[PDB]
């Protein structure tokens, strides 16, 4: 499958794409305002994620730091990124279907649209100003809005026992972005697409 990742934000982002233990495609790339980067994702990929990183500095060998979404200091991510990260999540070719979603379970940093470029399913979007509105205790100094589990490390926020309810903090993400997971037992906003669809991830879709 083919993903076009386009950066509509007015700032530079460093896109990243990984399935947890390995990079998808090159795994990472600088995108200036307006730049598009297209990648090949192998069919059958389970739990691939795409996200943006902000205020990065890398050297010639591709080692550095990002204020949000850092993946162990590397330009080409092979593990997942440090929160806060708005997440495009996808599993492809699962019994002939593709499943996609946007997640705030690991916080928010960049508004995002996740849509197919082929026929037969809707896209999802989380484009509200969650950093501007972030509750005082969830603001990450590096920019962005942390999830409650990252901040507080309680069983209720992290849902570690498998049973948890919505929280004051998760209800905030759900109210600004209904189409995204706000906590791990949230009512699924997963969208089912024909298997082997193709997609576009757009950062800052509105402004």
From Swiss-Prot:
InterPro entries: Osmotin/thaumatin-like_sf (IPR037176), Thaumatin (IPR001938), Thaumatin_CS (IPR017949). It comes from Thaumatococcus daniellii. GO terms for cellular component: cytoplasmic vesicle. Belongs to the thaumatin family. Its main location: cytoplasm. This is Thaumatin I. It comes from the Eukaryota. It is found in: Cytoplasmic vesicle. Disulfide bonds join 9-204, 56-66, 71-77, 121-193, 126-177, 134-145, 149-158, 159-164. Keywords: Cytoplasmic vesicle, Disulfide bond, Signal, Taste-modifying protein. Taste-modifying protein; intensely sweet-tasting. It is 100000 times sweeter than sucrose on a molar basis.
């Amino acid at each position: 499958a083919t993903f076009e990742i386009v950066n509509r934000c007015s700032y530079t982002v460093w896109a990243a794409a990984s399935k947890g233990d390995a990079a998808l495609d090159a795994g990472g790339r600088q995108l200036n305002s307006g730049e598009s980067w297209t990648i090949n994702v192998e069919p059958g990929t389970n739990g691939g994620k795409i996200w943006a990183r902000t205020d990065c500095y890398f050297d010639d060998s591709g080692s550095g730091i990002c204020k949000t979404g850092d993946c162990g200091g590397l330009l080409r991510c092979k593990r997942f990124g440090r929160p806060p990260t708005t997440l495009a999540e996808f599993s492809l070719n699962q019994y002939g279907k593709d499943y996609i979603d946007i997640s705030n379970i690991k916080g928010f940093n960049v508004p995002m649209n996740f849509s197919p470029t082929t026929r037969g399913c809707r896209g999802v979007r989380c484009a509200a100003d969650i950093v501007g509105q972030c509750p005082a205790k969830l603001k990450a100094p590096g920019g962005g809005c942390n999830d409650a589990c990252t901040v507080f490390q309680t069983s209720e926020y992290c849902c570690t026992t498998g049973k948890c309810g919505p929280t004051e903090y998760s209800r905030f993400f759900k109210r600004l972005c209904p189409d995204a997971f706000s906590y791990v037992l949230d009512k699924p906003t997963t969208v089912t697409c024909p298997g082997s669809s193709n997609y576009r991830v757009t950062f800052c879709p509105t402004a």
